[PDB]
Symmetry: C3
Subunit: 276 residues, 3 copies
């Protein structure tokens, strides 16, 4: 239960894009990864540097309507303006009615709710989205975290057939956050790696009946995550991840999970010719 404070900016980027950043001129798509433990409060001093109204809306976490980020609750931000949004989180526990209050932990995301339409359609399209992870006490922490957003037919708003690729070494505990936005359903698939369809992506134990999958149907505003042990049972290699909707894969919704041997090498990776 720490109270934490950050600045965030929305900015226009080149080529008709928009993004969030931790400093002016440093906006990225996806936006910065926000990580909190259950019980933490985060105050985000948000500045809209753009010429259109913009907002910050978050899935999963606790907020009052004054931090809804909506036209409806008059909690977006005028051009050039500043607003502090507050996100709270809670741990799980038993209610006075005997039921179990689910905690805030999970794989969540934030995004704009007012650019283009009062649902943020244009803001989302242009890049105003990012990942938020809320951890539960005791959760295992990864060696690296990678964010994959399927935004209509693009991955992280990159051009078709441009990745992103992510590197690891065999044995690394690698976390993926997978967010979808826009108009289309997708199926997220990874070669060589599987996860549990539950909160953490890992089965809790032999009593966990969660389904174990390597392919998952997602639609706009869905978020999930998981951890894998890179190359577990499969070894090193260039391991594709892709949408499995066939025309989407063919049109470029593919990237590589590049898993190195501990000697540094990737089996089969031969970028250059050799004489003779």
């Amino acid at each position: 239960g720490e109270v934490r404070r950050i600045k965030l900016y929305a900015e226009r980027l080149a080529d008709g894009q928009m993004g969030y950043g931790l400093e002016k001129g440093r906006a990225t798509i996806p936006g910065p990864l926000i990580e909190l433990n259950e019980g933490d409060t985060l105050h985000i001093e948000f500045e809209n540097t753009m010429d259109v109204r913009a907002s910050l809306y978050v899935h999963g976490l606790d907020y009052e309507v004054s931090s809804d980020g909506t036209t409806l609750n008059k909690s977006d931000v005028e051009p050039g303006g500043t607003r502090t949004y507050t996100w709270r989180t809670h741990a799980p526990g038993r209610r006075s009615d005997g039921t179990w209050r689910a905690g805030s932990a999970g794989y969540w995301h934030y995004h704009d709710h007012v650019v283009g339409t009062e649902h943020g359609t244009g803001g989302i399209r242009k890049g105003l989205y990012g990942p938020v992870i809320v951890r539960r006490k005791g959760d295992v922490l990864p060696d690296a975290t990678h964010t994959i957003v399927f935004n209509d037919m693009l991955i992280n708003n990159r051009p078709a057939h441009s990745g992103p690729n992510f590197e690891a070494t065999v044995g690394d505990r690698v976390e993926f956050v997978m967010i979808t936005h826009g108009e289309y359903y997708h199926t997220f698939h990874m070669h060589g790696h599987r996860w549990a369809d539950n909160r953490t992506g890992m089965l809790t134990g032999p009593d966990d009946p969660s389904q174990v999958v390597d392919n998952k149907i997602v639609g706009p505003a869905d978020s999930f995550g998981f951890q894998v042990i890179a190359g577990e049972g499969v070894g090193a290699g260039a391991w594709m991840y892709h949408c499995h909707v066939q025309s989407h894969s063919d049109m470029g919704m593919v990237g590589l999970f590049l898993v190195k041997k501990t000697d540094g090498t990737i089996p089969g990776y031969e970028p250059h010719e050799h004489s003779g």
Copy 2:
């Protein structure tokens, strides 16, 4: 459990849609909420008041082919006709083979299966759908139940941007039944509220590893439900619910969960 009877009518509405109702002239879209406990048997004395054949088809519950509500099993209803549909339910238990037979309990739905096409495409389009909840012993009961149906691009057949809205007070245990129909996938989203992706929509305890979500992909004939504590950790307010497919929200697949303070007041909001 208990043996029960209701009357149900299919009616063409004054605006030309089609609805089920517990009485003549009182059809609604969605149709009336049916609620059963596992073991209960329900006999539905159904009358088709319309000029085309209509039927009653239920997900999840136990019925014989004579209550399939289909043409294939000769169990639709002629115009002006009557037929008694029987729905049974069972509790969970151990089979003699050692496996666990799942109970009937869940968030289910009924709909027409013969209006327009032999899959009820017309009937469903026009409003012939409704919720059924089968409860397990010990299930927690809510203060209120609200049914949200994404039927093609409409919510409960309401015009674009016309709700429905649902009102509650802070702290109320509110149940939602969420059913999809037609041609389109959607994603159901609620502002300010979350639930577990499991039978009841509530975690059973610290050992339940179910996903806790505020957004869920659904397709035709999917049904789920959940209960929230209205405004828990978030306060009173107009809390939007909407499809999160961007063009669908923009086209009007939005409504409000209006959570009031215990003095009846709400923070000011500015609706469409």
Copy 3:
């Protein structure tokens, strides 16, 4: 953990189709059911009898990049060629750090990855798909296993309104393996029967909180499966399974689960 070997062939079929088989000239769509228990290894000696490159890619199981079936990892097969693919599987267990490694068990599937495109788009369209079941120790075995593949708008590449139908007797333990491919989402729906949305399709016991469903949204390359007791609580009947996407049911994405009395008859059928 047994080591098993099989042969597999990819063959062209009529109407521009393509399929896998366990014997030359016996290719089917879907391909043959492959069944393994956790820990088993399978070596598949694969021959591509066709005149274009083709491959074999599997979901869920353990393989090295030399068995990925992809151009990327130079593991497809040239026209008329042969290659041995190796699938391994593993049981669940605890890692040295105390975390739980999920097992390979599940309802999985295999398909082509290089016909038509580098994602096997044409291969899959034409019929190069089939089911693989990996069982865990103690799993209940069924009387029969039926495979239902929604491949674009066709079931098992059959023409509209042409089933397939599957027959059982009241009380039989019947397993379904349900795979989706291509471009479209679907909702898989069965009349008169329900299953748990977990690994086996049956709840593990009274503490399993998995949703119990009769309708499930699926997209390309999804796979799941379940077991039912045929007619349980509902009796004998012609019990439709269908996509519940209304135009898709109307256009023929429908079959029958024909559940017979012990005397062999069915109600008004």
